[PDB]
Write an enzyme that holds these catalytic residues in place. Sequence first.
Site, PDB file in Angstrom:
ATOM      1  N   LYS A   1      37.422   7.252 -54.118  1.00  0.00           N
ATOM      2  CA  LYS A   1      36.459   7.337 -53.340  1.00  0.00           C
ATOM      3  C   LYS A   1      35.711   5.963 -53.185  1.00  0.00           C
ATOM      4  CE  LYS A   1      36.152  12.294 -54.010  1.00  0.00           C
ATOM      5  NZ  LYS A   1      37.211  12.519 -54.816  1.00  0.00           N
TER       6      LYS A   1
ATOM      7  N   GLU B   1      56.803   8.434 -70.666  1.00  0.00           N
ATOM      8  CA  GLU B   1      56.114   9.391 -71.140  1.00  0.00           C
ATOM      9  C   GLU B   1      55.550   9.132 -72.510  1.00  0.00           C
ATOM     10  OE1 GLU B   1      59.496  12.232 -70.952  1.00  0.00           O
ATOM     11  OE2 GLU B   1      58.020  13.750 -70.188  1.00  0.00           O
TER      12      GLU B   1
ATOM     13  N   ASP C   1      31.258  14.378 -63.727  1.00  0.00           N
ATOM     14  CA  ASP C   1      32.166  14.126 -63.002  1.00  0.00           C
ATOM     15  C   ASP C   1      31.523  13.341 -61.818  1.00  0.00           C
ATOM     16  OD1 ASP C   1      34.290  14.070 -60.943  1.00  0.00           O
ATOM     17  OD2 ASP C   1      34.776  16.261 -60.840  1.00  0.00           O
TER      18      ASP C   1
ATOM     19  N   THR D   1      37.376  10.488 -59.953  1.00  0.00           N
ATOM     20  CA  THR D   1      38.633   9.923 -59.371  1.00  0.00           C
ATOM     21  C   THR D   1      38.459   8.305 -59.006  1.00  0.00           C
ATOM     22  OG1 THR D   1      37.498  10.206 -57.138  1.00  0.00           O
ATOM     23  CG2 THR D   1      38.824  11.888 -57.971  1.00  0.00           C
TER      24      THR D   1
ATOM     25  N   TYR E   1      60.202   6.004 -65.938  1.00  0.00           N
ATOM     26  CA  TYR E   1      59.306   7.022 -66.844  1.00  0.00           C
ATOM     27  C   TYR E   1      59.043   6.347 -68.026  1.00  0.00           C
ATOM     28  CZ  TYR E   1      59.934  11.793 -65.346  1.00  0.00           C
ATOM     29  OH  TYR E   1      59.879  12.926 -64.843  1.00  0.00           O
TER      30      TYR E   1
ATOM     31  N   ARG F   1      44.700   6.740 -55.128  1.00  0.00           N
ATOM     32  CA  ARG F   1      44.341   8.232 -55.596  1.00  0.00           C
ATOM     33  C   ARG F   1      44.819   8.320 -57.055  1.00  0.00           C
ATOM     34  NH1 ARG F   1      43.312  10.089 -50.490  1.00  0.00           N
ATOM     35  NH2 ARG F   1      42.630  12.019 -51.087  1.00  0.00           N
TER      36      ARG F   1
HETATM   37  C1  LIG Z   1      33.238  15.605 -57.387  1.00  0.00           C
HETATM   38  C2  LIG Z   1      34.837  15.479 -57.182  1.00  0.00           C
HETATM   39  N1  LIG Z   1      35.683  15.727 -58.622  1.00  0.00           N
HETATM   40  C3  LIG Z   1      36.873  15.923 -58.430  1.00  0.00           C
HETATM   41  C4  LIG Z   1      37.387  15.909 -56.774  1.00  0.00           C
HETATM   42  C5  LIG Z   1      39.035  16.139 -56.927  1.00  0.00           C
HETATM   43  O1  LIG Z   1      39.519  14.694 -56.470  1.00  0.00           O
HETATM   44  P1  LIG Z   1      41.379  14.889 -56.197  1.00  0.00           P
HETATM   45  O2  LIG Z   1      41.287  15.581 -54.538  1.00  0.00           O
HETATM   46  O3  LIG Z   1      41.986  13.650 -56.168  1.00  0.00           O
HETATM   47  O4  LIG Z   1      41.891  15.845 -57.177  1.00  0.00           O
HETATM   48  C6  LIG Z   1      36.717  15.885 -55.876  1.00  0.00           C
HETATM   49  C7  LIG Z   1      37.231  15.689 -54.589  1.00  0.00           C
HETATM   50  N2  LIG Z   1      36.213  15.951 -53.670  1.00  0.00           N
HETATM   51  C8  LIG Z   1      36.650  15.930 -52.032  1.00  0.00           C
HETATM   52  C9  LIG Z   1      35.660  15.918 -51.092  1.00  0.00           C
HETATM   53  O5  LIG Z   1      34.197  16.016 -51.600  1.00  0.00           O
HETATM   54  O6  LIG Z   1      35.809  15.803 -49.908  1.00  0.00           O
HETATM   55  C10 LIG Z   1      35.311  15.743 -56.145  1.00  0.00           C
HETATM   56  O7  LIG Z   1      34.410  15.612 -54.801  1.00  0.00           O
HETATM   57  C1  LIG Z   2      63.255  19.683 -65.977  1.00  0.00           C
HETATM   58  C2  LIG Z   2      62.025  18.971 -65.827  1.00  0.00           C
HETATM   59  N1  LIG Z   2      61.037  19.480 -65.107  1.00  0.00           N
HETATM   60  C3  LIG Z   2      59.765  19.150 -65.014  1.00  0.00           C
HETATM   61  C4  LIG Z   2      59.585  17.707 -65.326  1.00  0.00           C
HETATM   62  C5  LIG Z   2      58.393  16.893 -65.450  1.00  0.00           C
HETATM   63  O1  LIG Z   2      58.260  16.194 -64.057  1.00  0.00           O
HETATM   64  P1  LIG Z   2      57.089  14.939 -64.108  1.00  0.00           P
HETATM   65  O2  LIG Z   2      57.222  13.894 -65.410  1.00  0.00           O
HETATM   66  O3  LIG Z   2      57.087  14.290 -62.702  1.00  0.00           O
HETATM   67  O4  LIG Z   2      55.845  15.684 -64.481  1.00  0.00           O
HETATM   68  C6  LIG Z   2      60.697  17.223 -66.375  1.00  0.00           C
HETATM   69  C7  LIG Z   2      60.182  15.781 -66.682  1.00  0.00           C
HETATM   70  N2  LIG Z   2      61.667  15.252 -67.701  1.00  0.00           N
HETATM   71  C8  LIG Z   2      61.484  13.966 -68.061  1.00  0.00           C
HETATM   72  C9  LIG Z   2      62.815  13.805 -68.922  1.00  0.00           C
HETATM   73  O5  LIG Z   2      63.672  14.560 -69.039  1.00  0.00           O
HETATM   74  O6  LIG Z   2      63.032  12.388 -69.239  1.00  0.00           O
HETATM   75  C10 LIG Z   2      61.985  17.675 -66.225  1.00  0.00           C
HETATM   76  O7  LIG Z   2      63.071  17.089 -66.862  1.00  0.00           O
END
Ligand SMILES: Cc1ncc(COP(=O)(O)O)c(CNCC(=O)O)c1O
Ligand SMILES: Cc1ncc(COP(=O)(O)O)c(CNCC(=O)O)c1O
Lengths: 462, 463, 463, 462
Positions: free
Chosen positions: C245, C62, C216, C242, C60, C251
Site C-alpha cells: 500500500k 522452509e 495493523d 502489508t 524452497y 504484495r
Molecule cells: C488494514 C488492512 N489490513 C490487512 C489487509 C489485508 O491485506 P491483503 O489484501 O494483502 O491480505 C488490508 C487490505 N485492505 C484492502 C483495502 O482496504 O482495499 C487492510 O486494509
Molecule cells: C503435499 C504438500 N502440500 C502442501 C505443501 C505446501 O506448499 P507451500 O509451501 O506452497 O505452502 C507442500 C510443501 N511441501 C514442501 C516439501 O515437500 O519440500 C506439500 O509437499
Amino acid sequence: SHMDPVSVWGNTPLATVDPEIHDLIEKEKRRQCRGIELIASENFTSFAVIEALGSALTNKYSEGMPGNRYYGGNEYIDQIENLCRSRALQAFHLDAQSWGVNVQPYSGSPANFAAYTAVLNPHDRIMGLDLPSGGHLTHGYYTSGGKKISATSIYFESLPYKVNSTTGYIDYDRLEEKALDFRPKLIICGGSAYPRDWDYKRFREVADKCGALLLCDMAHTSGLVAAQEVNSPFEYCDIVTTTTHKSLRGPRAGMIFYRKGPKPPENAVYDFEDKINFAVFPSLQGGPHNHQIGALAVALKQAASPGFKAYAKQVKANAVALGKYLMGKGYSLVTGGTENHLVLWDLRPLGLTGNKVEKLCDLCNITVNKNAVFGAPGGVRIGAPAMTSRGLVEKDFEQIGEFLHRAVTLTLEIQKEHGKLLKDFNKGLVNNKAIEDLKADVEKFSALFDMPGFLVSEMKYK
Amino acid sequence: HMDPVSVWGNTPLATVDPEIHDLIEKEKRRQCRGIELIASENFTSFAVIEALGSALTNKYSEGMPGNRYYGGNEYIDQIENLCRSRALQAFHLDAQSWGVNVQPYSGSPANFAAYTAVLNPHDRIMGLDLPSGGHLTHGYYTSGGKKISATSIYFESLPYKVNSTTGYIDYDRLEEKALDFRPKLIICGGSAYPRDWDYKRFREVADKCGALLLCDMAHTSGLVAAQEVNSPFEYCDIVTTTTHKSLRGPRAGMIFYRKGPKPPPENAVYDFEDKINFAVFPSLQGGPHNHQIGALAVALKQAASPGFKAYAKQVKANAVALGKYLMGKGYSLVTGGTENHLVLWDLRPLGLTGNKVEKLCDLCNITVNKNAVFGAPGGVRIGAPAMTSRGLVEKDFEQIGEFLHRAVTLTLEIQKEHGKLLKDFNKGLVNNKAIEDLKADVEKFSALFDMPGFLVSEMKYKD
Amino acid sequence: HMDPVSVWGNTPLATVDPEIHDLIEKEKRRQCRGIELIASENFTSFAVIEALGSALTNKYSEGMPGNRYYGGNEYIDQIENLCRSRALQAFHLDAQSWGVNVQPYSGSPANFAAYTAVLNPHDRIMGLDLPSGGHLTHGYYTSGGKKISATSIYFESLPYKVNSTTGYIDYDRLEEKALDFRPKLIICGGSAYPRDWDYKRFREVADKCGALLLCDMAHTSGLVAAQEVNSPFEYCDIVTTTTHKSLRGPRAGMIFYRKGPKPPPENAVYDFEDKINFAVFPSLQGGPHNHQIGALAVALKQAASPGFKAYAKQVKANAVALGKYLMGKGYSLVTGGTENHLVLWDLRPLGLTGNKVEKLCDLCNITVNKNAVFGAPGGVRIGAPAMTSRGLVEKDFEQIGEFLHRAVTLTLEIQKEHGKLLKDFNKGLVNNKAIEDLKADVEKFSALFDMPGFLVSEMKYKD
Amino acid sequence: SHMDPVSVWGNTPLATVDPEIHDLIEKEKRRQCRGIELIASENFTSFAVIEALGSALTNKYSEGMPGNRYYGGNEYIDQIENLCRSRALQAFHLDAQSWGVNVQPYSGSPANFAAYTAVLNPHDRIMGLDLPSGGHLTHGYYTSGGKKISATSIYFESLPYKVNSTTGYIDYDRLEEKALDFRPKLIICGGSAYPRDWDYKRFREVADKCGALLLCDMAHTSGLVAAQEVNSPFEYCDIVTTTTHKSLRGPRAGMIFYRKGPKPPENAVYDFEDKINFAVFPSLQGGPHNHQIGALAVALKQAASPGFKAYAKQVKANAVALGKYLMGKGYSLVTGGTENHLVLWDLRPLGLTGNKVEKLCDLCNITVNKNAVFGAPGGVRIGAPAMTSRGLVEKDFEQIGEFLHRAVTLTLEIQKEHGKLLKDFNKGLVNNKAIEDLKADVEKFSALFDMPGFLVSEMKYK
Ligand SMILES: Cc1ncc(COP(=O)(O)O)c(CNCC(=O)O)c1O
Ligand SMILES: Cc1ncc(COP(=O)(O)O)c(CNCC(=O)O)c1O
Ligand SMILES: Cc1ncc(COP(=O)(O)O)c(CNCC(=O)O)c1O
Ligand SMILES: Cc1ncc(COP(=O)(O)O)c(CNCC(=O)O)c1O
C-alpha cells in the site's frame, strides 16, 4: 462370616441405624422452626412431598422417557412421570398443544445447562443478567480478571447486561444495544436478587431484532407465576426453565418448558421437544430421580389449588409490608420497593457490609444472605416465601422488620465501639447480652407459628 | 385465605394425593413381587430412605463446609463433614492422601464435574466402548458422527475395545490407541464388563502417553468398599462413582481425588482438590441436595459394617452360581464367567436378540436389560445386587437361572413358530399360556423373601 | 520427445502466451491512462518488479535464516537477513527491542499468524467496526450472526465503533466495551479511518483490561516509516502490516514484535519472537516466497531514502488538498478532513449511495470504492498514494476533485431524471454523452504524468 | 526537501537501485545452474512465467471473484482470472459442468486451510498421512509429547494414518479401521515423500463407509496428474488441492478443485463452490496476487502442451533410472523403487543419518533433504522434476547416482575416521580434497545442460 438379615439393616428405623445422623437431622429440624428463615431461595415443603421424596421410587432405574424407555419394569414410573408432566402444564395454565415439559432435571443448574446444550453449540453466545445486578451463576459469570467461573462461560460465550446504575431497574436500552453489538444466540431473563417484575415483551422485541432465542429462568418466582401473580414468561419466551423448591414449594428438582406446534407469524413448527429431551438424556443425565419426580407431581397438584394462589398473594404482600417497615426506619431498598417475593436492602448508606449484618443476624437465628448491589457485598437479600409458608402475614412480617432493625442497630453499635475491621467487629459478638436478648425474642416469636413437613409435637428437641 | 399449615403441610401423602400414593404403592408391589435383575439397581434401606425424605431438603447451603456463602449451616456442615469422612473410611483411604466431594447430584454430574476440573473444552478422552461394556458418560458418538454424550460434545472422545474373540479388555490395542490419539484423560470402569480391571496396566499406559487416569467405579463401588475386587485408588488419580448401585445407598455421586505429595520434578504435590471442588460449585452445580448427603452418610456407615462385606461376598457368589447354572444349560457368557456382580449373556449363538428376551422376561416380571456385545444388541445383562439384598443365596439364584432358562425356551418357541422379525415375534406374546404360567411362578417365588426399605405387611396391595 | 529448454523455458512471454501478454499490456494501459484512487493501491518500482520476477521463485527454504530444514540457502539467508534488518531500519527500531518476520504471504496471513501465535482458539478479540473504518481480518459477523471473517470463525470478536456524530473513534465506548467483553487482544488500525490513532490511549485501555495491543498499520505503513503519522511501535506489543500500500512495495506481509526486557513481576522479558516465528512456520505457512522477500528488501531500502519521506509528505498534502477542494463545493467528509493518505466522502447528504458514484466513476476510468460510513454504503473512499507515485501534486489533485465533482453532478442528474432505484439509475448510463466526455478528459489528464514500474514508451497500446 | 522523480526511483533497473540484492540474486542464479538440485518439491519455471510474475499485475487490488468484485477497474483482471480457471480445468481434463476451481490461494498451505474452513467447522476431525510415513504438515501434526504443531491440529482434530511398518506401502486395512474408530469428517490423501501411487478408489470406499469427505493434496505430483501419468484423484475425490510450483512447473501459488453439478447414485447437487470461494475470500484471504494468477495462467497453458506430457514421462523414468542405479550399489529405497517423481533413500542400513549425507552433499553443490523413514531422520528424499526441466535424461540421472554414491562413500569414510558424533564428523569436512574434487565434477557436469527462466549468457557470475 454371615450376611445381615433384611430386618436388621433394611427395615430398622434411622434413629437406631445411625443415631449420629438422626440427631443432626433433629437439630436441623429445630433450627428450621425456632428461627426466622429469610433466605429468598428457601421454603418449607409439605409432609406429603417429603413422603414421596423418601419412598421406594429411589430404587428404580428408568433411563429414557415415558413410552420410550431403555428397559422394562416402568409401568408405574411412566404413569408417575406422565402425571408430573401434565400437572406441570396445568399449574402454569399451558395448552398441551403449544407447550411441553421435561421433568427429569436433577436441579435448576442441570435444567439450565441441558437447555443450553439442546439449542446451542459449544461457544455460542449467551446474554444474562449480571450477578451484581441480580443475575445467577448459570446465566454466565467471569470475573474482572477474566477468570471463567460459571460452566456457562466456560463452554459458551457469555456477556452480561446490567441494571441502571442509579434506579436499579433493568436498562432495556443498554440491553438492546449490547444485544446488537454482541449478537447472542440466546438471551436469558430471570434472576436471583432482582426485586421487580420483568418486561418479557421488550425482551421478545430485543430477541427478534437481534435474532436470538429467548429463555426465562423463573426459578425464584415460579410459585408466583403458577398463581398468576406476576408476569407470565410463557407469553413471549421460547423456553422456560425453573427450579421447583423455591417459591413453588416443592422438592429440589428442575423443569424445562418448551414451545411446540405452529409458530407465530412457511408453515413452520417448533423444533424444541426432541432437542430438549435428548439433551437431558442421553446427553447429560443418566437415570431420573423418580422419588424427586413423584414428589414434584405432588407439589404441582398442591400448586394448582386455590389455597396456593392465596399463598402467593400473601408472599408478595409480606415482602411489600416488610419493605415498607424498613423504609419507614430510613433504610434504603434497591428500586425502593418490591413487586415479588424479596427485597434487596442497600447497606452502604449505613457504612455496613452484608457480611457484618449477616453474621450478627445468624447469631440471632435470623438467616439472611449478603448480596451484591449495583456497584465485599454492600447489601443483604431478604425473602418472604419460607416464613409465609409457616402462616405469617403482614403484621408478623412487620415484627420481622423490627427484629432486623434491632439487628442492624446492634451491628452499628458494635462497629462504632470496636471498629470497622472484621477482627474489631468480632469482639462485639462475644458475650453480648443484647444479642442474646434478640435471639431469645426471635426464638419465642418463631415458636408462635406452625411448621410444615413434620410434626413439632414429635420432634426430639423441643 | 391461606390454607392452615396442618392442612396442606402436615397431612399425609395418602390424603393429599391419592393418585400418586396409589402409584407408589403399586411400584412397591412390583419391586417385591418380581425378579429384579437390572445390574445397576438395588434396594436401599429404610434408614437411608428416612434421611432422604427429611427436612434436609429445605436447606440451601451453597459452598463447602467451613466455606459457605451464607449462614444457618451449623448442622448441615457436620452432616457433610460426616459424609466425607465416612466416604474415606468406607474405602480405607488415608485423609492425607485422598479427599472427596459428595455434592454431585448423580453419577453423570460427578463425571462431568471431574472432566471440567482437570480438562479444557475439546481435550481428548479415552473410555471403554459402549458395545464393549462402557458407559455413555465415558464418550459416545454414532456411526454418522453425531455426538450423543455430552462428553463427546464438549470434549473429544475415542473409545477402546475388548478383544474381539476373548471378550477381555485389549490392553495392547488400548496402549496403541493411546499413543496415536494422545488423550489428556483415560477412563476405566464400565457398565457391563464382567471381569476385574488391571489398574496397574492402566497406570502404565497413562504414564507412557502422559494422561490422567480416572476410574468410574459406579457399578462395583460396593465390591470395592468391601475389598472384594481390585481397588482403583491404588493407581488412579481420580475416582468417581454413583452411590445407589452395589453401594446400596441413595441416588448421588462422589468424586475422590488424590492429595499430598506426588510419587517420583521437585517436591510436587497434587493439585486436584481446589479444581474438583470449584468445578462442582460454583462452576456446574448450585445448592447441594442435603437430603441426599445425609442419606449417603447413612449408606456409607452401613457400607463399613461386617454385614456389608458379607453382602458383597454373596453378590459375587450369586453371580457366579447364576452364570454357572446358565452355562450348564449350554448358554454362552461373555468371557465365560464373571468376577463381579453381573453376567453378560450372549444370545447370538441362540439366534436371538436382546430385545426379544428382555420383552418376554418383562412380561413375566423378570427385569433384565438388553445389552450390546462385542460387535439390535445380541445380549442381555443380568445383575445380582438387588435380589441379593432381599436375602437370596446361591440356590435361590440357581432357581432364577431356571426361570431365565424357561423364558429363553419360550422365546425360541415363539421365534420358531411365528418368525425371526420383531413383528412376527409380537404375535406369540398375545394370550400366551406358557408366559402367564411363568409369571405366576415368578410371583410365588418372589413372595418368599424379605424386602428392605419398607414393610411388606403394611403394603396397600397384598398377596 | 521433450521440448528444448530454449523453446519452453527461455522464450519471452509475448511469444509463449500472446493471450496473457496482450491482457497484461491492456492492464498496463488502464493503470496509466486513468485516475487510480483506491486507497489501498500503489504503483511499485521497476526495481521491485525485477526482484519479484526472478529466479528466487524457484527456491524452497522452509524455516528461518540460520535454522533451515535443508541446504542450498546460502544466498536466500542473506536476502532474508537483509530484508529483516532493512525492515527495522525503515521504521527506526532498535534490534534489541524489536524483531520482525517477513515471511507472511500477504496482510491477512500476517494478521492470522499473529493471532495464532499469542491466542488460543476462541479467545476474545476487539477490532474497529467495518462501518467505522475497520477491516475484515479484525473480525466481522453479520446481523444474522453468520461468521464471515476467519477471525470471527476461529476466535470470538467484538467491534468497537466511531462516535456516532463526530466520526472519531469513541475511546470512552471502547474502554467500556473492553471492560465488559475482556478481550485477550485489542486491534488498532483500519482501512478507511481518515484520522490518526491515539496509541497511548489504546495502551491505557489494554493495560486496564489486561489485553495485548496489536496495530495493523497496513494502510499508513509508508507514512509511519517516514514518521509522518503517529508511530504504533511506541505503545503496541505487535505491529502487522502489508507492504504493497503506502509502503509502495510488493504484495507481502510482515509481523513486528517486541524483544528484550519488559517495562515495569521480576526482570521479565518479552516472549513474542519464538511464538510468532513458529506460528508462521511450521504452523500456518509452508515455504516462503523468496521472490517477494527480495522485492520487499528493495522496497524497504527505497522506503529509507529522503525521497520517500518527501513522497509521504506529498501524499498527506495531496489528500488534504483534494479534501479541501471537495468541501469547498459543499461536499461532506467524515471528520471534516484527513490526517493521512485518504478521505472518506459522505454521500448521504446528497441523497446518493456509494454504489452509484463508484459505478459512474469507473465508466470514466476513475477507480474509487464504495465504503460504509457510521451507520448500501453511503460513502466512497478516496486515496492519494497511487496518483502521488505518478508525480501529481496539490494542483493536480484539485483537478482530480473537479473530475469527482463532475462525476457526482452527473450522478445526481441521472437520479433526478430516471429515479432513485438502481435499475432506474442504470438507464442513465446507456449512451451518455456527458459520461463519455468526462472519460475523454480523464484520459487526456492521466496521460500527462510519468508511470513507475514500466516504460510507457514501450507499451503495446499507445496514445 | 524534494520528491524523487519517477524515472529515478520507479523506472531505474534493479542493478542500479539495489546492487546488494541484485548481486545476491545473481549469486543464486549461478547456484541454481552450477549444482545438482534434487529437492523433490523444487523446479525451474519458464521465463514466460517469470515475466508475468514480475509485471504490473502486482499493482491491482481485485477483492472478490470475476463478475462479482467489490470495486471497479477489473475488466482485464477478470479476463486473466477467467482464463486461468478455464486453463486449470483443461490441464487436468475436467468438464466445467462437473468441476470448478479457485485460483486465488497464495500458496499450498493457504489452499489446504481454505478448503478445510469451507467444508469443516472448528474442531471437526481430519485424517492425513503421518509425517514419518510421508505426509505433510498441513494434513495435521502433533508431536509424541502432545504439542500441536500444525494449524490443522490446532483448529481441527487430526489423527494420522501410517504406512506398513515393513513394506512401506500405505496400510489400507489399518486406515479403514482407524477411520471407523475415529470417524473423521474429512480424509486427506496425498503426501510429500511417498514414493508410490495412491489407490483413490479404496480411499473412496473407506470415506463412504465412515461418512467422510475425501480430499486429495496432489501438490507434489500435480504435473504428473495433468499429463495423466499417475492415477487421477478427480475420479474419486470430492476436493483436490494443489500447489503450482512443484512438478507443475509454475509460479508459487495454490488451487482448489471442487465438484459441482449432479451427485453420483433425491436429485441432490454438490454444494462446494460457494463454500470454497467464500472461504478463500472474504473469510481467509484479502486481495488476490494477480501477478501470481497471470503467471499461473501461463504455466497452465504450457502444462497442456504435448511437450509437457513428455516431460512428465521423463521425470518418472529419471526417478526410476536413478533408483535402479542406487539399488545396484546395495542401497535401500523405501518400497524398493518408485512410481512417481521421487525416491526415498533409507540410510539406516549404512549407519548414517540424513543430516550427515545432506550436509556433505550440500558442500558438493548437491541439494537433497533429510527425510523421516518408517520408524534424527534416517533417510534422504531425492526428486527428479528440477533437473529433468534442464533436459537431463536417464543416462544423466545415472551419473547423478554416481555422484550420490561418491558422496555417501565420503560420508562413511569421514565417519569411520573421525566418529559418529556431529563434532567428530565436521572435522572431516574441513580441507577435504575428495569433497573439493566431487564439487568440481558436479560443477562441470551441471554446466553441461541448459537452464530455463533466464539466459546463462546474460548472467553476472559465469
Ligand atoms: C488494514 C488492512 N489490513 C490487512 C489487509 C489485508 O491485506 P491483503 O489484501 O494483502 O491480505 C488490508 C487490505 N485492505 C484492502 C483495502 O482496504 O482495499 C487492510 O486494509
Ligand atoms: C503435499 C504438500 N502440500 C502442501 C505443501 C505446501 O506448499 P507451500 O509451501 O506452497 O505452502 C507442500 C510443501 N511441501 C514442501 C516439501 O515437500 O519440500 C506439500 O509437499
Ligand atoms: C459406570 C456408570 N457410570 C455412571 C453412570 C451414571 O449414573 P447416574 O444414572 O446416577 O447418572 C452409570 C449409570 N449406569 C446405568 C446402568 O448401567 O444401567 C454407570 O453405569
Ligand atoms: C434464578 C436461579 N436459577 C437457577 C438456580 C440454581 O438452582 P439449584 O441450586 O437447584 O441448582 C438458582 C439458585 N439460586 C440460589 C439462591 O438464589 O440462593 C437460581 O436463583
